[PDB]
Design an enzyme around this catalytic site. Sequence first.
Site, short mmCIF file in Angstrom:
data_model
loop_
_atom_site.label_atom_id
_atom_site.label_comp_id
_atom_site.label_asym_id
_atom_site.label_seq_id
_atom_site.Cartn_x
_atom_site.Cartn_y
_atom_site.Cartn_z
N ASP A 35 17.52 5.82 30.06
CA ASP A 35 18.22 5.85 28.78
C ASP A 35 19.61 5.24 28.91
O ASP A 35 20.55 5.92 29.34
CB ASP A 35 18.34 7.30 28.31
CG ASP A 35 18.99 7.42 26.95
OD1 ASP A 35 19.20 6.38 26.30
OD2 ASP A 35 19.31 8.57 26.54
N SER A 199 26.64 -8.46 18.14
CA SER A 199 25.73 -9.54 17.80
C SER A 199 26.40 -10.48 16.80
O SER A 199 27.19 -10.07 15.95
CB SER A 199 24.43 -8.96 17.21
OG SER A 199 23.59 -9.99 16.75
#
Length: 330
Positions: A35, A199
Amino acid sequence: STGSATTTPIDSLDDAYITPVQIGTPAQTLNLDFDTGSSDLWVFSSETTASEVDGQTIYTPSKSTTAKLLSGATWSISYGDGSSSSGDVYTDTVSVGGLTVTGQAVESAKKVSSSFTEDSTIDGLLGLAFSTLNTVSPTQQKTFFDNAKASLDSPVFTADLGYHAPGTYNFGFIDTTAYTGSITYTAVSTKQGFWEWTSTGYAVGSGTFKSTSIDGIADTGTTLLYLPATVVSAYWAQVSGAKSSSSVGGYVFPCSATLPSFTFGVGSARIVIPGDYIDFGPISTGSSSCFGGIQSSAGIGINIFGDVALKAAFVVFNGATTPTLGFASK
């Protein structure tokens, strides 16, 4: 040193991925959920409340000759999905794919929430976010990667998750045969303890690319792709019959519909998530309504590039003095 381990989807939908981890001496092998969105290595154990264990493999520290109680230490974690667990702490030898850390904090669960009990395939979590998020008290503990870093050939790990198939976590090296083209690296902020990056934009199917900054986290421990409501609306508007269902808790669509791809920007580069990756199957057995793999992050408070996004790429988690993230197509 290096390590290399195969990671395997827990079910036919890729709801999560499990990777075998050796703990203690003699080795006890548990299948953990790696994770990159958390920083605790915790396991179902001989100390876990009996009624809360249902098929998981447990770590028994008393059977490990290298286990040592971390005296006074406790831990307690709550995850974005509402799940939680807590307990005490041992240090022990932990190996992943041939890479061994001695003195790793292994957080032994005394209590786990129902969602963990109900998932027989996940024996615990292995956190790979920054150690500043680790919940052990009074002395915060380091992640497996942080402990291994100095020994690794290169201070990196990579995630290469499969679509409806096994993939690979590598530690200490970049497998140049595992991706196409070049790896584009992008800046990371560690201020919230995550692999947080920005992004450069998105496209829906064959549509034109929209240049817009999207701050989010690279999180192998989250199944879906969670993005701003504007972006998500623009995606599902291209799927005939799709709608946001408050009763279901997100966007659903008729399984007879064709899903467009979703492209996200990494610098000037582009990662294309094929439409099929966005299908998470019937909301209930026999239903013609399918659950979508791109959902709104509104009210999470952060955008999450979860498995839906990451499995479309070869992803480098670069733990150099100034950490960065790399993405390649594959």
